[PDB]
Amino acid sequence: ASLTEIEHLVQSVCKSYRETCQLRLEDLLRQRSNIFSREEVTGYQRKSMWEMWERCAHHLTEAIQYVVEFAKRLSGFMELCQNDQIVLLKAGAMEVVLVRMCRAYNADNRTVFFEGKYGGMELFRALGCSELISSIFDFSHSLSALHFSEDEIALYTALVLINAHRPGLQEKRKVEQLQYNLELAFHHHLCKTHRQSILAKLPPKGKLRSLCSQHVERLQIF
Numbered sequence: 513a514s515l516t517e518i519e520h521l522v523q524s525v526c527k528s529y530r531e532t533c534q535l536r537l538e539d540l541l542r543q544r545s546n547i548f549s550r551e552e553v554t555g556y557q558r559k560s561m562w563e564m565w566e567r568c569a570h571h572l573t574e575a576i577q578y579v580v581e582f583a584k585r586l587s588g589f590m591e592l593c594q595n596d597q598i599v600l601l602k603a604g605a606m607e608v609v610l611v612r613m614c615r616a617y618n619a620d621n622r623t624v625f626f627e628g629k630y631g632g633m634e635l636f637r638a639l640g641c642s643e644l645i646s647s648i649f650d651f652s653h654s655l656s657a658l659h660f661s662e663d664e665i666a667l668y669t670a671l672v673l674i675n676a677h678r679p680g681l682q683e684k685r686k687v688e689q690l691q692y693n694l695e696l697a698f699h700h701h702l703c704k705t706h707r708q709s710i711l712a713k714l715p716p717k718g719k720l721r722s723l724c725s726q727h728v729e730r731l732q733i734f
């Protein structure tokens with residue numbers, strides 16, 4: 513690569529993400545005072561466990577649609593094999609969705625956006641795994657504690673998928689090359705932004721996996 517490709521790619525990554533940022537950040541924060549009420553909350557609480565889990569899967573799956581198309585615009589991804597273009601997504605794509613959830617997270621009230629409004633963890637009282645839900649909130653918290661920006665998201669999220677160490681890969685070299693020119697662009701852009709400090713304030717590599725992995729297993733009931 514070259515000093516300019518280095519820039520060209522970040523911009524290209526900041527490009528692809530913007531198209532796939534699912535929701536307008538602009539519109540997101542604006543809806544602060546729009547908060548659920550006890551009755552509606554008490555309403556949502558009432559439904560059986562069978563309903564919410566599915567309701568979640570809607571917002572979930574639909575969100576993951578964006579995550580995939582994000583992967584495409586990226587260089588070298590297109591010139592990758594059929595078998596190997598999926599393997600990463602299998603593990604990766606789930607994890608990224610959770611990452612984007614931080615945007616819908618406000619630490620000033622411990623709530624997350626959902627179905628038009630913001631709501632606390634008690635909105636999922638009916639899921640029977642309060643511990644699970646909470647850990648996700650605690651994950652979002654740490655990310656909100658990072659005061660994260662769009663263009664680092666685009667760059668973090670990208671490396672999640674491009675893990676050449678995801679087992680089941682056949683064309684292993686080609687991906688590492690994508691990874692190397694991705695690992696570089698991130699830090700490089702971070703160094704250009706002096707945000708290298710948060711790199712020690714980042715989740716361990718096993719946490720987000722252990723989150724999503726153990727997350728989907730309970731879901732693998734439906």
Ligand SMILES: C[C@H]1[C@H](C)CC[C@]2(C(=O)O)CC[C@]3(C)C(=CC[C@@H]4[C@@]5(C)CC[C@H](O)C(C)(C)[C@@H]5CC[C@]43C)[C@H]12
Nearest residue numbers: 534535568571572575609612613616625626627645648
């Ligand atoms: C990921 C974001 C997306 C960036 C845009 C906002 C989002 C949406 O599309 O509505 C808000 C709701 C959550 C956070 C979203 C989808 C999944 C989550 C999820 C179901 C994730 C799994 C968790 O267990 C939990 C139940 C806390 C959330 C609920 C909020 C939801 C349903 C969307």
